[PDB]
Design a protein around this nucleic acid. Structure first.
Ligand SMILES: [Mg+2]
Lengths: 572, 33, 54, 1230, 89
RNA sequence: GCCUUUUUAUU
DNA sequence: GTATTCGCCGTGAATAAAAAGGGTA
DNA sequence: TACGGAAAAATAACACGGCGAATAC
């Protein structure tokens, strides 16, 4: 049809259709004047090639190209591939009542809420404004209701907050390589044209606040709004579909505010005093007479029915007891509460307490882990971590250890392959020796006199608080930070013989930073290219498994497979 | 609809879809739209 | 319909035209492209009543 | 010893090792590559003369007429640089060539080339777009290999690639069947016999050139073989070799290397050999009988007992055959002779024709490689052709000769047996640079051969009665071939010019995309990674990650493009262990042979190394060498970084994972309306502004007479003049390519003398010669009650108040009037002419330019919502608004020429009259008809600007890569505040340093805290009004810290009024330069903290904003350099409820200009159906887009108050239903 | 947007989707591979209405077996061969 | 009222 | 008849912005 | 006011499985 290939003030298909009808009209001009056999076999071949170029391109004797060197789009080129109807116009249909902007943190709002802008949600809910105007009787038409929106007077926003008071709104990342890329929210009207995506579901989106611009969607009808509240809401999306661990994991900052509280320090302000309950520790800390971490004895009331015992609990862990629900035990709270530790704390609250005390608990973790992170002051600086004194002696020993290995190769003691495996052997052993020497200078370095003997306790360095918790830094990432980063890989796959002797605190060398980029730019070229393969793997995995739907409750078959865990490794 | 059947296009089925026959290779007029 | 969206639209549409292959409206990629209720949500209950109608 | 523009804002360098070589011209790969393209040089190596002497003389086939060429000339362009940026005319001077008609000369103009400005870019269609260089495959012999599991199947593969500058690719690939196959243009592979038989070679001439020949002799026994001393290496035989009763090789045992040297002293040319050892070999030689002349044996056949018995009746004693081996000489060439169907010469050319007459097949192979028009190799294409084959000379013919094909086959057996090494495509010697003047030489030669074929057809019908050269060559294909390359092409990239760093890095951008290079989405994995040979030439930092990483990579600071095209960087030659002052440019081939030491080494006053074992590299990998064994040394500490990566401070302290993300965002910073210098920067920061063309650089030095923001005049001194004075028209608030403001503010006062190298007016995002991409805010690396869950930024209200990050975005609203200019619709922003005047505060959704159609319906354009602001200027060119610019430019010409003549007055009638005729010459070039698009009478362009205010949503980051947006407008009372009272301006997440090694943003923050604290004490000494001499001692003491600074400035050379004006620029803070690898240590910043009133520790205790309590852990405050990016939330927010739909399918549109319909995508359908949202997914693709009968019934249902969805037939599937029904495939619905 | 059009061609045309597919729908019906089923379509060879004969074998076929068999080229001979063969046979 | 290429840029 | 290599063919993420170009005399 | 398509282009030339076709044994 002509609306399927419309002219515009020249297309890539109607000019291809001119190649076919010109060949069709010339064959009608050959039959009436009795054309010879030589000229009709050549004209029928170009007529056959015109239909071969119209219905397809790329499968012929030669693919037809346009005047501007680009390959011309045939009827097959607009039905297959990314530019076909099946991917661009049947699976990738553009969506009205739906916007797109960058995402923000938004710590004051709840888990089921987010932040929609004023002029953005007014443009997304534009017929929803017109429905409420004709319902009350302010503008009982469609022409003057458009004038009320574009004038932006005071009565438009009071109508708007009634519509968006409990309306579900789908927040959607533009790459969704996971199930949790589309989550619903109940937004409130804010200033600023950015959406306030919740930090608890920020790990569920697998997308940090690095300036990523992503979509947003709304359901119009009431049967689609209940799909967003019962299935797509962020409240009932606690557990991941992949594993039993919850996808709502505190990643960087709220876990950092939890880790500064749950700590033990000697010679603190208010050490060894009694407290009436967990709520008195908020009175104990906000007045400022006692520290956030001090070994005291607070009274707590544990449930499953209420039991009471006076156990050793610091001031920061006593803030957590007003945050947890009743039936949550204390034995999961008494640890240091790192990111790997509070992944089971959110899982045990989902297990025995239920989902209804989980949303309030997860929101009050984010309220406490953010507000006390301001009072924490956990930062990064050149005075926080320190190059250990054993590092300068290990590097001087390792540079002296490669001197006798190189002199053995000149005399002819070892071969080329035996020397290459020996330099990596004595450097990775030196990389592990400098890893433990840097670790003890961050674990048991700074001491405070607790009115007596100098006891060995856990250091309060902010780099180790982000390392032991497993929040954003691992055991190998702080190894590259304060100590040497170790052996770097070549682009083909081999290892550099001489690794970086220095570290990032005093700066690398020119060649040391150059061989550091041999694994960093390689890993970033690995990252930017495997997302084209895993994105193709995402399409290959769904398109074969989209037919499989659960359809029966019970069948009656006893057939199955035998389950055995991983045993071939050394440790389970 | 409950099902979609795909088969070969008959010469009578192609003319059944079309309401008219086109004879001109040029799309529109050059002077006016 | 679910096979033509994946790849080989020039091939698998020729495999289905010469063989019939009248699909019975089952699958999720088909119901997305033909634009109706998904049989893997609350539309499965619509598909459960649709088998009760037919 | 310092310049005049450096005395106002002198900046301390923290480099321990001094730079013995100053920074060269940053546009040397762009200007000097194109400067040789313009001038008429007598040589034909580099420039446009290489394109003219290769095509001309044009000799027709039997036409007896020749077209001779003598010279070419470029005249002045019809417009200047400033007129083409607003009009749309291509900045291109008419190029006129003198052509001689011999069996009559005229300087005939054929086409126009886009001329290069002082910035280094071209103006094609009113936009600043420059072609960029190419990291493509160098023309020559490339030995490749794919080991492991890529096309191996249990065997190693060796493919040899001979690629030209242009023509047909020639490949020699192996197989698991161990047979050399030749590949031309990646087609069906042919055997290696017919590619050698096409060079007039017989069958016997192939084997002796690629193998060794052994001599045989017949005696009373069966046969004897002459022993060759170069054949026993790796020879395992079951029989024993004897020589005159002496046993050398044991039977059935692998011999060691002792028998090789023992046999060399007793060389015997005859041994005894059994009859079964020779039958396994090939004969490789034809023989003709003497009796009847019949062929005894065929060509390349295996011997047997019957074939060896025919040698006695033939009568020849010498048998010339080969020697087979598995490690010395590979027999894979001899096995290919049984694979090919034919062995003749005439029957092999028709196989290339199928790759079928005799004349067409012979002329095809001669035009494939032997001809110079199709196949061509330049001096660089023959350099790699001779270096990879280890030839004697480097110069040679462009064609592949008869002896050049057999020489690459000898090297292919050497790399197969292990005698020669295999090359790699990631080597910088194997990556030629198609520069600006090199690609303009070829694309003009594309038009030069399109008109060569035009005159080969026109001269046949010409009467030759002294014909004019005007109608011989046509102006259409010569001009369009240059406009297709400089316009819509892969190399003509859209140059983003919001900040001058992106203007310089786009000139030094090496993009492998193009017709000669590989594309981005289909590239292999090995080309994306960085090779160890990238030391000094191409940086590994500046790569735009995403769809194209590794192909596009910036060129370094000191890297230069050779006349061949290979990349070199200057090294300091070390003679007898002592480095010298002179430099030596060495390529990537000479880098592997030479032992080049590293720049980061402590040197004495003489030039010796203080260590016995210094760090070094030879092939790129890290190693250790002595101070005497090294040959060269790096000339500076900015070798491996580019001009965009060098501006990032503490790059040794910064991670390579994050600096790759850091400099990509630095090339898209928007110019702030107030330019505040970087408190922590590099010595390169003074060099980017003086090398960029958007910053006003004075051509001649001297004092100034009238300093205005519109134009600055400079009184030229007596030595700088040749007279008069020069003028510099500053581009104030013009539109750039990315809809961003460009304005040139002056930096000098009245009566300020400047030199030649000084800056008289800073450009956009620049102040006093220092590039100011952003503003130094008080960054506190701490979370505050949320807002820092990730690396986003919490900003102050003070930043919103003092306009510290608000930028200006000047958008273009063009009006195509095919359509009267009158605004008679069936307002206050118009001057009764249909055109908006200058300075109207428009709002999104009103009429801007009235355009009605003759019928009367209104179909004009309007301003979209969200870009409401004032108009800079409305450029009307081809009615009352059109003559306003025509009188404004007349008064601008009456202000430019009248100021020019009045200086030389203080005979006279002739010097005044010559400027009057130049005024009318400038008048005629303005009021003339501008070249526009056909079909319209005039086009009006509206430079509509909008003050982009900082708000939650604007992407802001540092130079290190702290990627994030603004959390909220946090007020000034809520931010944390130090003991002196000043609150912080940026509250930032400190949890990036656990993720990546981003401590360099804290070394910048700690140095920025020290530089602001010194600048606070200078501001304290200026508010108290202390003595000028006591103010000098504080600056002299401040510039003396460090181990050994390379500046070593003296404040006694500065005057008393000079140091008083110095403290005015030092009031906001102390400008401090730190190198990327020769930077300040951890102890030098703590020593700098002892100078100020703040303590030595990097973190200091301070109270909370909303709480008022002192933190138990001190946070690291400081003036870290932050910059606002180009991704703003005013442009990256698009919302659509209902709007115009597409015409192909009934679906919404893309882009904010097309009302912003959000595309769902195939990846988000599966995330929507995962939860079981059947009612939502059915809405998301039918009611939103497909159901045209449904979306109007839905729009009548939502306004009714009923949220009810009806099931309908999707028209987007009806789009798909007609596509299959348009083919010969039946499809229907049941 | 729903109404379509058709053209009446003077010669029949073979479908390119069913030809260049793997396996060929036209090639499996005429029990020929891909190489010879496109030589008769682009008028380089002739088939009878089977065996494949080139253009130089057509001048001798009309004077030897011209009255027994008739041969054509293009998709008209392909359509006449598909009209000659039967599905059940 | 658009569509398709190419380039830049983002996740 | 049974492999076996190869010519050609399927695929090579997702999403926002700008530019020309939309047949040649 | 006409034909739309051919041969030259002094074209652009990728990589990892796959399906069927034309050979060697
Ligand atoms: Mg991100």
């Amino acid at each position: 049809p002509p609306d399927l290939r419309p002219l515009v003030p020249t297309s890539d298909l109607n000019d291809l259709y001119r190649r076919v009808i010109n060949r069709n009209n010339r064959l009608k001009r050959l039959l009436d004047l009795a054309a010879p056999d030589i000229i009709v076999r050549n004209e029928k071949r170009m007529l056959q090639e015109a239909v071969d170029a119209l219905l397809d391109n790329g499968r012929r004797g030669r693919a037809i190209t346009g005047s501007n060197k680009r390959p011309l789009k045939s009827l097959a080129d607009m039905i297959k591939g990314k530019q076909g109807r099946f991917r661009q116009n049947l699976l990738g249909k553009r969506v009205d009542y739906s916007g797109r902007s960058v995402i923000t943190v938004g710590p004051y709002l709840r888990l089921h809420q987010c932040g929609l802008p004023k002029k953005m949600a007014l443009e997304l809910f534009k017929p929803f404004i017109y429905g409420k105007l004709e319902l009350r009787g302010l503008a009982t038409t469609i022409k003057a209701a458009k004038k009320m929106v574009e004038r932006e007077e005071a009565v438009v926003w009071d109508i708007l907050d009634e519509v968006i008071r409990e309306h579900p709104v789908l927040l959607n990342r533009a790459p969704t390589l996971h199930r949790l890329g589309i989550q619903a929210f109940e937004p409130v009207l804010i200033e600023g044209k950015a959406i306030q995506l919740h930090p608890l579901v920020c790990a569920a989106y697998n997308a940090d606040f690095d300036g990523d611009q992503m979509a947003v969607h709304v359901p119009l009808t009431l049967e689609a709004q209940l799909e967003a509240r019962a299935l797509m809401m962020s409240t009932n999306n606690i557990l991941s579909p992949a594993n039993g661990e919850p996808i709502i994991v505190p990643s960087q900052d709220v876990v950092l505010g939890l880790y500064y509280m749950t700590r033990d320090c000697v010679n603190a302000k208010g050490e060894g005093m009694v407290l009436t309950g967990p709520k008195e520790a908020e009175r104990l800390y906000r007045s400022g007479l006692a520290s956030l971490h001090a070994r005291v004895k607070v009274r707590i009331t544990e449930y499953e029915v209420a039991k009471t015992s006076l156990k050793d609990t610091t001031v920061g862990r006593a803030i957590l007891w007003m945050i947890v629900p009743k039936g949550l035990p204390y034995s999961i709270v008494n640890q240091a509460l790192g990111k790997k530790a509070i992944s089971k704390m959110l899982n045990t609250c989902y297990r025995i307490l239920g989902l209804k005390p989980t949303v309030i608990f997860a929101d009050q973790i984010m309220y406490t882990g953010f507000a006390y992170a301001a009072r924490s002051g956990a930062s990064v600086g050149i005075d926080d971590m320190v190059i250990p004194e054993k590092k300068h002696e290990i590097i001087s020993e390792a540079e002296a250890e490669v001197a006798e290995i190189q002199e053995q190769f000149q005399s002819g003691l070892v071969t080329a392959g035996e020397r290459y495996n020996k330099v990596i052997d004595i450097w990775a052993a030196a990389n592990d020796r400098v890893s433990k020497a840097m670790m003890d200078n961050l674990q048991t370095e700074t001491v405070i006199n607790r009115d007596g003997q100098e006891e060995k306790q856990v250091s309060f360095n902010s780099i180790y608080m982000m390392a032991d918790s497993g929040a954003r830094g691992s055991a190998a990432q702080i190894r590259q930070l304060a100590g040497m980063r170790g052996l770097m890989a070549k682009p083909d796959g081999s290892i550099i013989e001489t690794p970086i002797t220095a570290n990032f605190r005093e700066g690398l060398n020119v060649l040391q930073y150059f061989i550091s980029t041999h694994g960093a730019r390689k890993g970033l070229a690995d990252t930017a290219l495997k997302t084209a393969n895993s994105g193709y793997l995402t399409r290959r995995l769904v398109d074969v498994a989209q037919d499989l739907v659960v359809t029966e409750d019970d069948c009656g078959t006893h057939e199955g497979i035998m389950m055995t865990p991983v045993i071939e490794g050394g440790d389970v | 609809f409950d099902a979609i059947k795909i088969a070969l296009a008959s010469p009578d089925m192609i003319r059944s879809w079309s309401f008219g026959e086109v004879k001109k290779p040029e799309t529109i007029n050059y002077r006016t739209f | 319909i679910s096979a033509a969206s994946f790849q080989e639209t020039t091939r698998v549409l020729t495999e289905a035209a010469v063989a019939g292959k009248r699909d019975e409206l089952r699958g999720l990629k088909e119901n997305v492209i033909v634009g109706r209720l998904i049989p893997a949500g609350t539309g499965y209950a619509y598909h459960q009543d649709r088998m009760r109608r037919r | 010893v310092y310049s005049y523009t450096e005395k106002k804002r002198i900046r301390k360098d923290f480099g321990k090792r001094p730079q013995v070589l100053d920074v060269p011209y940053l546009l040397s790969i762009q200007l000097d590559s194109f400067q040789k393209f313009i001038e008429q040089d007598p040589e034909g190596q580099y420039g446009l003369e290489a394109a003219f002497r290769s095509v001309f003389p044009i000799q027709s086939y039997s036409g007896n007429s020749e077209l001779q060429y003598v010279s070419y000339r470029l005249g002045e362009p019809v417009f200047d640089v400033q007129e083409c940026q607003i009009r749309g005319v291509t900045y291109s001077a008419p190029l006129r060539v003198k052509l001689r008609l011999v069996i009559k000369e005229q300087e005939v103009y054929m086409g126009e080339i886009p001329l290069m400005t002082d910035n280094g870019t071209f103006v094609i269609n009113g936009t600043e777009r420059v072609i960029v260089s190419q990291l493509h495959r160098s023309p020559g012999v490339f030995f490749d290999s794919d080991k492991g599991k890529t096309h191996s199947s249990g065997k190693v593969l060796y493919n040899a690639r001979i690629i030209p500058y242009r023509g047909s690719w020639l490949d020699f690939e192996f197989d698991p069947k161990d047979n050399l196959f030749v590949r031309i243009d990646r087609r069906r592979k042919l055997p290696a016999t017919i590619i050698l038989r096409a060079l007039n070679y017989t069958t016997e001439q192939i084997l002796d050139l690629f193998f060794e020949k052994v001599i045989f002799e017949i005696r009373d026994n069966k046969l004897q073989m002459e022993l060759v001393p170069e054949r026993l290496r790796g020879e395992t035989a079951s029989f024993d070799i004897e020589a005159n009763g002496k046993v050398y090789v044991e039977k059935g045992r692998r011999i060691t290397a002792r028998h090789i040297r023992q046999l060399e002293k007793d060389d015997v040319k005859l041994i005894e050999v059994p009859v079964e050892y020779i039958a396994g070999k090939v004969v490789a030689k034809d023989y003709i009988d003497e009796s009847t002349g019949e062929l005894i044996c065929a060509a390349n056949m295996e011997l047997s007992l019957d074939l060896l018995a025919k040698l006695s009746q033939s009568g020849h004693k010498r048998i010339e055959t080969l020697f087979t081996n598995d490690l010395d000489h590979g027999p894979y060439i001899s096995e290919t002779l049984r694979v090919d169907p034919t062995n003749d010469r005439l029957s092999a050319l028709v196989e290339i024709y199928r790759m079928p007459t005799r004349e067409a097949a012979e002329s095809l192979f001669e035009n494939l490689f032997f001809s110079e028009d199709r196949y061509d190799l330049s001096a660089v294409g023959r350099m790699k052709f001779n270096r990879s084959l280890l030839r004697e000379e480097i110069e040679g013919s462009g064609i592949l000769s008869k002896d050049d094909i057999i020489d690459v086959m000898k090297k292919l057996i050497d790399i197969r047996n292990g005698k020669g090494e295999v090359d790699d495509i990631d080597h910088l010697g194997n990556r030629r640079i198609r520069s600006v003047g090199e690609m303009a030489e070829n694309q003009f030669r594309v038009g030069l051969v399109r008109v060569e074929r035009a005159v080969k057809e026109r001269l046949s019908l010409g009467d030759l009665d002294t014909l004019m050269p005007q109608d011989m060559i046509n102006a259409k294909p010569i001009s369009a071939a240059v406009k297709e390359f400089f316009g819509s092409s892969q190399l003509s990239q859209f140059m983003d010019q919001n900040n001058p760093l992106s203007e310089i890095t786009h000139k030094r951008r090496i993009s492998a995309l193009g017709p000669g290079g590989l594309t981005r989405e289909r590239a292999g994995f090995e080309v994306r990674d960085v090779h160890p040979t990238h030391y000094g030439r191409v940086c590994p930092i500046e790569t735009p990650e995403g769809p194209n990483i590794g192909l596009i990579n910036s060129l370094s600071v000191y890297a230069q493009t050779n006349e061949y095209g290979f990349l070199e960087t200057p090294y300091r030659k070390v003679t007898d262990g002592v480095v010298t002052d002179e430099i030596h440019y060495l390529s990537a081939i000479e880098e592997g042979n030479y032992v080049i030491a590293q720049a980061n080494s402590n040197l004495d006053e003489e030039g010796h190394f203080v260590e016995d074992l210094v760090t070094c590299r030879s092939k790129g990998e890290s190693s250790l060498f002595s101070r005497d064994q090294v040959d060269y040394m790096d000339v500076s500490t900015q070798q491996v970084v580019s001009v965009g990566a060098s501006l990032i401070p503490f790059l040794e302290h910064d991670d390579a994972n994050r600096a790759l993300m850091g400099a990509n965002m630095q090339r898209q910073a928007v110019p702030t309306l107030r330019a505040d210098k970087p408190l922590v920067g590099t010595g390169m920061e003074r060099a980017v502004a003086v090398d960029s063309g958007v910053t006003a650089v004075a051509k001649r030095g001297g004092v100034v007479q009238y300093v205005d923001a519109s134009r600055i005049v400079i009184k030229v001194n007596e030595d700088e003049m040749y007279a008069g004075i020069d003028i510099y028209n500053l581009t104030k608030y013009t539109r750039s390519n990315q809809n961003t403001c460009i304005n040139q503010m002056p930096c000098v006062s009245l009566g300020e003398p400047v030199e030649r190298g000084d800056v008289l007016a800073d450009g956009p995002s620049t102040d006093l010669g220092e590039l100011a991409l952003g503003q130094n805010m008080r960054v506190a690396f701490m979370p505050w009650n949320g807002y820092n869950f990730e690396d986003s930024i919490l900003v102050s209200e003070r930043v919103v108040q003092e306009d510290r990050f608000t930028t200006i975005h000047i958008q273009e609203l063009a009006c195509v009037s095919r359509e009267e200019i009158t605004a008679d619709i069936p307002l206050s922003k118009l001057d009764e002419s249909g055109i908006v005047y200058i300075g109207a505060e428009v709002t999104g959704g009103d009429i801007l330019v009235g355009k009605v159609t003759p019928k009367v319906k209104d179909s004009s354009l309007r301003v979209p919502n969200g870009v409401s602001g004032t108009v800079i200027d409305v450029q009307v060119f081809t009615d009352k608004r059109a003559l306003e610019i025509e009188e404004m430019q007349l008064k601008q010409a009456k202000k430019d020429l009248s100021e020019e003549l009045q200086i030389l007055e203080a005979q006279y009638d002739e010097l005044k009259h010559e400027f009057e005729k130049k005024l009318e010459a400038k008048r005629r070039k303005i009021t003339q008809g501008d070249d526009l698009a056909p079909g319209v009478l005039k086009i009006v362009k509206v430079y509509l600007a909008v003050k982009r205010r900082i708000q939650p949503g604007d992407k802001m980051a540092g130079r290190h890569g702290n990627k994030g947006v603004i959390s909220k407008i946090n007020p000034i009372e809520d931010m944390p505040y130090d003991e002196n009272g000043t609150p912080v301006d940026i509250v930032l997440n400190p949890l990036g340093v656990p993720s990546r090694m981003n401590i360099g943003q804290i070394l910048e923050t700690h140095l920025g805290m020290a530089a602001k604290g010194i600048g606070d004490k200078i501001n304290a000494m200026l508010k108290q009004q202390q003595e000028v001499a006591k103010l000098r001692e504080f600056i002299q003491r401040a510039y003396d810290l460090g181990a050994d600074v390379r500046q070593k400035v003296d404040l006694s050379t500065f005057s008393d009024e000079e140091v008083m004006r110095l403290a005015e620029n030092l009031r906001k803070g102390m400008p401090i330069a730190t190198p990327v690898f020769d930077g300040a240590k951890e102890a030098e910043i703590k020593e700098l903290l002892k100078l100020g009133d703040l303590p030595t520790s990097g973190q200091i205790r301070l109270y909370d904003g909303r709480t008022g309590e002192q933190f138990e852990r001190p946070v690291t405050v400081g003036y870290m350099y932050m910059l606002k990016l180009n991704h703003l939330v005013d442009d990256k927010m698009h919302a659509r409820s209902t709007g115009s739909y597409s015409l192909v399918t009934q679906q919404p549109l893309g882009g904010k200009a097309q009302f912003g319909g959000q595309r769902f995508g195939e990846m988000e359908v599966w995330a929507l159906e995962a939860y079981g949202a059947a009612y939502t997914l059915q809405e998301m693709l039918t009611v939103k887009s497909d159901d045209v009968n449904g979306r109007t019934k839905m729009y009548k249902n939502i306004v009714d108050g009923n949220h009810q969805m009806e099931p309908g037939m999707p028209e987007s599937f009806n789009v798909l239903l007609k596509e299959i029904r348009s083919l010969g495939i039946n499809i229907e619905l049941e | 947007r729903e109404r379509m059009g058709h053209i009446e061609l003077a010669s029949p045309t073979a479908h390119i989707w069913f030809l260049k597919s793997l396996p060929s729908r036209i090639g499996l019906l005429l029990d020929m591979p891909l190489r010879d089923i496109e030589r008769v379509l682009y008028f380089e060879s002739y088939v009878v209405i089977q065996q494949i004969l080139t253009e130089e074998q057509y001048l001798d076929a009309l004077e030897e077996f011209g009255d027994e068999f008739d041969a054509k080229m293009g998709a008209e001979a392909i359509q006449a061969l598909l009209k000659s063969m039967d599905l059940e046979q």
